[PDB]
Paper text:
Rac1 binds to WRC at two distinct sites—the A and D sites.
Consistent with these observations, the pyrene-actin polymerization assay showed both WRCapo and WRCD-Rac1 were autoinhibited and could be activated by the addition of free Rac1 (blue curves), whereas WRCAD-Rac1 was basally active (solid blue curve). The D site engages with Rac1 mainly through a largely hydrophobic surface of ~550 Å2 presented by a.a. 961-978 of Sra1, which contains a helix-turn-loop structure formed by the H11b1 helix and the loop between H11b1 and H11a helices. Among them, the side chains of Y967 on Sra1 and F37 on Rac1 undertake a dramatic rotation of ~80° and 110°, respectively, creating a tight π-π stacking between the two residues (curved arrows).
Numbering used by the authors:
A (entry chain E): 1 to 106
B (entry chain B): 822 to 981, 987 to 1121
C (entry chain C): 24 to 177, 499 to 518, 528 to 544
D (entry chain A): 5 to 27, 57 to 337, 341 to 367, 380 to 540, 542 to 574, 578 to 784
Write the structure that this text describes.
Amino acid sequence: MAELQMLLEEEIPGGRRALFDSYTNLERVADYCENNYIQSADKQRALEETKAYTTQSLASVAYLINTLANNVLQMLDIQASQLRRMESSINHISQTVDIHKEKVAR
Amino acid sequence: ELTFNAEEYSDISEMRSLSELLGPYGMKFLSESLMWHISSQVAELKKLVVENVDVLTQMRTSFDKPDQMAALFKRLSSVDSVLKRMTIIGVILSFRSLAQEALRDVLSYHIPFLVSSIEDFKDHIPRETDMKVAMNVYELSSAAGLPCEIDPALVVALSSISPEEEYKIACLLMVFVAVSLPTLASNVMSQYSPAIEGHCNNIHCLAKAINQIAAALFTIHKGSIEDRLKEFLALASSSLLKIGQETDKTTTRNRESVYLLLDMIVQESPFLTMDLLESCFPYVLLRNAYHAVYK
Amino acid sequence: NELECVTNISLANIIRQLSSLSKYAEDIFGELFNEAHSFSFRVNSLQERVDRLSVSVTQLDPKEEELSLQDITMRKAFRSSTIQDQQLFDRKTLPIPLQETYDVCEQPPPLNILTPYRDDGKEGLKFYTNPSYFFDLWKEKMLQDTEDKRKEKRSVLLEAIRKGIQLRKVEEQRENDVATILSRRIAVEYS
Amino acid sequence: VTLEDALSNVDLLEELPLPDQQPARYIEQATVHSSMNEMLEEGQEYAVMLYTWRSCSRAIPQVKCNEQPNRVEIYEKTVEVLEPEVTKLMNFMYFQRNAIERFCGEVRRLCHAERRKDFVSEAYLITLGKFINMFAVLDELKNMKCSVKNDHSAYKRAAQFLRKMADPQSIQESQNLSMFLANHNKITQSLQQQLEVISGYEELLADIVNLCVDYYENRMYLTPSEKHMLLKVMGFGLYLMDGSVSNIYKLDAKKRINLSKIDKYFKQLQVVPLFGDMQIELARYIKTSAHYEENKSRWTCTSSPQYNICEQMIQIREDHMRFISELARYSAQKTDAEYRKLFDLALQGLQLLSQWSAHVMEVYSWKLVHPTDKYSNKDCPDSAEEYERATRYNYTSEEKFALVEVIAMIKGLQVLMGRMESVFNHAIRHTVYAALQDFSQVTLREPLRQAIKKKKNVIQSVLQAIRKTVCDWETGHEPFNDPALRGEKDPKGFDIKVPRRAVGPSSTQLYMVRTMLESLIADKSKTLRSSLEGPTILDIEKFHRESFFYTHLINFSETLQQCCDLSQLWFREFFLELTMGRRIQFPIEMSMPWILTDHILETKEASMMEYVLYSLDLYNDSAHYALTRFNKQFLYDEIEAEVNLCFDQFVYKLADQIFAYYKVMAGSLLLDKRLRSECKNQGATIHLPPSNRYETLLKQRHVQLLGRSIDLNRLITQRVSAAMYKSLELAI
């Protein structure tokens, strides 16, 4: 049960903060690459640099999405299992209650 | 006109009275006799399965090449006998299900404590446990009429050729049945009737027949039911979709009615989900067929 | 090279699209986290309730049970919750991305600054667009139809049960909900 | 940090379990074309602005006497509220004047005597047709909108009282705008008057109309919008031809234009949606022609059947099944055959979706333009608005069911095609690249050799330009051992390896190549066609006619979404203006999706029960159209307000009927069979309850509406629980 709170209040907010940071940095990097291409003597260097930047950012975004998605799936699984466990205890309680009622009737 | 009406003997009220008169012992005896009949049917089916092993073996590996499958399907012999036997098995299983639900309803108010205890025990039994204790749990549950996923009586009957060879025959049975599904489209009796919610030749019980037979066979042989049922679904979907392109009225008289067989199979099968059907069979075709069979 | 300038612009646009995808993922993940966190609160609360109920139930005593024939109907009857969801398309339910898509769209003219100079005091903007027109006209039509439709259609335990029936008779049952309006029309078409 | 690592990450991300899904001189031409496109983007903006205009003078506190205490106090408010609204009218007037002047200048430029018999691209003619259609629709919007004049003149009384127009130029521009608005058919009249001054414009109109007719006859279009645009341009051009100087009937006798084809096309299809909820009657352009009175017998379209959609459902259904069956089987590198198969399958699906959308729009427009009456329809009451008879009582139950079925099929095919976005895009682009490279690197060789051999520099220059614009040399340069360049016949040979990669050519490159290639086949052009053999020209025409849809298919998503546009089924600005303040907005029972859903629910049709949800996303489509194209907040607000009650009514009725059907089935199940048989024998049969498919709706948890996910199952559960409690209490 402890891992539920951990995955709730230490993983998902981390992924969110990370994704917002990614959006801001990505806008900054598009502006930077555009600037490098027209105030650089070697255009091909900026193009390769630009290509490298575009390749990188995509990998980072994919990794963050994968991790976040995995965490969400695990959280759902943990919750469903706990709910199922609760459903068993509640059924036992109901069985005890109606057994007591039948005993009182007898 | 027969001398009796089946609706006056198979109705819920009549089934409930029969269950009340008989009891769990009588219901178990009836189920055992039905499983004996189903085992005889399966043994007869195995002869047809084995007598066409060569074509079936190549069929399984060529599902993606219709050119050779078209010629291969022409070499199969007795393609309607298998369908008839599966329909008989499905009818027997449907009768068993009616009896079991009647017994469950009867016992639901006669011994509520024992029924509740059995339901609680079966529901919260870890499936990771070996089949040795799961079979006993399922037998105990079915003694009260519970809807167990795997029928212990069917397993016992079908349990009663090397071990590896019996598994290959079981696997090839599903492939043989799948490719014979489109042959029903040419039958005039395969017309779906909304008033009946099923076909006139009882081919709608083929879903239950296939599911129960596959479950019993692949739990007896320590096989994987999910994987085998997924193979059956892929082969059946491909065979049916090839029919959709054809324009001959005689061969496609009840193609739309036959298309609903996949939907029924997925609905009543506890191992298959709509996601698998959609990945290999769009639901729009089933929706269109449902629209057409109503008018 | 003009072609080289084009490719750089395309790469910048691709980075911008990557940021847009980042925001399309972030909003969904935040909404999912919020709803799952609320679900976790509910689960924890009901777990506390369940353990309390179990520890209470494991103390019952059949001999302690006492049945009062007189209090059988003098007792308040238990009723389960009957909450029904309605108004599922309100402004509060608008997703954020639609919020940005909408707040950037052209706003209606400031006709609301003319209300003080109107003799009847009716809202000026309501002469331009009236979203509540659907609801008010439909309600008026439904009420009129219903009004026409009615015309178209046209021992000590003994003391306890007596008190119960008296309470039930006197304590009978006691609108801008569509479901209520429809229930009225069908009930009126009946007697 | 590498491309391979990023691709791997994407594959890894995709590998997750996600269950429970559902229950030269051509440069000048290019520049002019670009300018025309830019002008068109502005014309569309002005048209949409005009369409979504609402009377702003109604809310004004109209003054009855001339001595009101606050008479002077409201004029400033009126001025400050209507200044931007009149600025838009001034901008529209300036834009339309500039557009008319530019179109007249281009017509004069292309109508010169020496330039008359030169070569002009078909795209330019299509653009001129688009311009004339834009002018016609703008004139129609100006004529229909009677509130713009009132608002402008109220602002006129507001400004003149305050004496803020003392500037002479302000008075002049105000008078110009007032007279522009007062006149009827002012835009068309001005353009026409400016047309006669040019001599020979009839020839340009004629070849434009001929190009449009040829395109329509050969089905040279993909989206229904283009299909309607062709007919609209034909009609408007025919209207423009007839006048003081030019006569179509005399021109027709010269065989310059064909009137029989246009007449037949108008007879088969009579009405198309001009803009928004307004439809254009094609025969009006002929009936209003200058010389139509003395030649009415020539036209059968004007005098007066086939719009019944209930009789065309068999072909629709059969086609749908055949296509869905073909596509289902296509759910490491493959041969060109598979890519070509995917390309043709995508083209066929897009064409089928466009055909269905065109049929639906045509039937809707015809019904709108032909309202019924109590004499024809008995259900229609004596008192009813124009929209009532036009829509609500103008559809039969079978017609509504057919429309719902067609819409559901369209949306199902759309989603199925979208599921295969990547495969279709890859196959289409690979096929396009392979075809372009193979053509430009092999097919042009023989022609080039012939040209060099016979000293045809004119052909050689354009052929070399074509081969230099697109051809990609795997070796990094054009081969030097090629015998075609030297002009001597190749040995026996000279195998050349054409590279293969999946990318479509840029729009500029494709347009440039097409313009060069269809210049060689031009009959008008001394004709260049006369300098080429037969097989080469035949192959060139084959390639040119095949490459028409490359641009549309490259933007596969946009084309697919365009071919399935159904947002025009909700807007009612035209009919609202036709009320003149009586109706601020039509009630719930007038929006076609609501009528369809309510009819399906009330009739309790088992077959159509599964289409109730498919007939509900028209609201989402209309909201998207308003928020993306119209960009009007109030339209979305009204759509949301309507949906808020539509969904509630639908949910309540669905739950009630589901509970009733289930209770009836349960009661029938327990009824004694012998009693039923005895009653049937005696003549008192107890009718059984018809079956239904409510289970599909019960298993629905993803109903999407305006970005909201609604759990229909929860609401149905609550309603059935309440009904069960009420039934138990009633029994007790």
